Structure 1
């Protein structure tokens, strides 16, 4: 039985977002990629470096906003820009959110030598696409 990235139904009560609900064979069919960069195109280069950067960015953002993230990040790259679009729960006071945004933007910009922007969209609670 295939097990990759699938959320197996247990009782009909566990909530899953849109991305968690869909299985890998639905990528590019019912769900887009969580990272968009020209690395994997024909003839382009530095795919490995972009992949490592994306993995580190996801880990760093997950560990920097503990429990704040309501979904996976979206890492867009335009030129040397780097936009991290995130969906965050409305738990913390906005002061902490702004502090973390400034911190993460400056630290990532100095760590990857590229202008990193962080766009946060807040939701009252984790969006439930269905229950499993």
Structure 2
């Protein structure tokens, strides 16, 4: 009995998504990595910097778009350029959506001194993999 990145089986009234439903020993087998960088590979460096910075990215964006997201994020770092992909709900107005998008992109670019872009996919209700 191991408790690691898994939801308890309930009576069947708990909507759960793919990534948080599947176990952490099924990551490479039936999942993908949220982030993708080369610091983990051999020859690269600053892997600790990559990890801390991307964790801070996820935290700051999750908390500056609170209540709109319903799943983990997708980070994609090609050389210099950084890309983020999110899945959100149609909770608030496109005005606020675009304002916060530009605000966060500008702040992150100014902070990390790096070209950054982010995309968002709207959903009426969060997709559920199963009822556990």
> Could you say which TM-score interval applies, normalised by the shorter chain?
over 0.9
SS at match of 2:5: coil
After TM superposition, the score normalised by the length of structure 1 is 0.97
1:66 alignment counterpart:
66
Distance 1:130 1:10 in 2: 11
Runs of 4+ residues deviating >3 angstroms: none
**In the TM superposition, what whole-angstrom CA distance separates every residue of 1:78-121 from its partner, at most 9, and x where no partner exists?**
11111110001111110100001000100000011101101111
SS of the equivalent of 1:11 reads: coil
1: CA distance between counterparts of 2:57 and 2:46? 16
CA RMSD of aligned residues (A): 0.7
Partner-residue secondary structure (3-state), 1:82? strand
Tell me the residue number matched to 2:99.
Answer: 99
Uncovered stretches (5+) of structure 1, i.e. residues with no partner? none
Q: Distance in 2 between matches of 1:90 and 1:37?
A: 31
Q: May I ask how many residue pairs the two structures share in their alignment? A: 132
2:8 — aligned with what? 8
2:58 aligns to what SS in structure 1? helix
Offset, 1:43: 1.8
TM-score with structure 2 setting the length: 0.97
Q: Which runs of 5+ in 2 are unaligned?
A: none
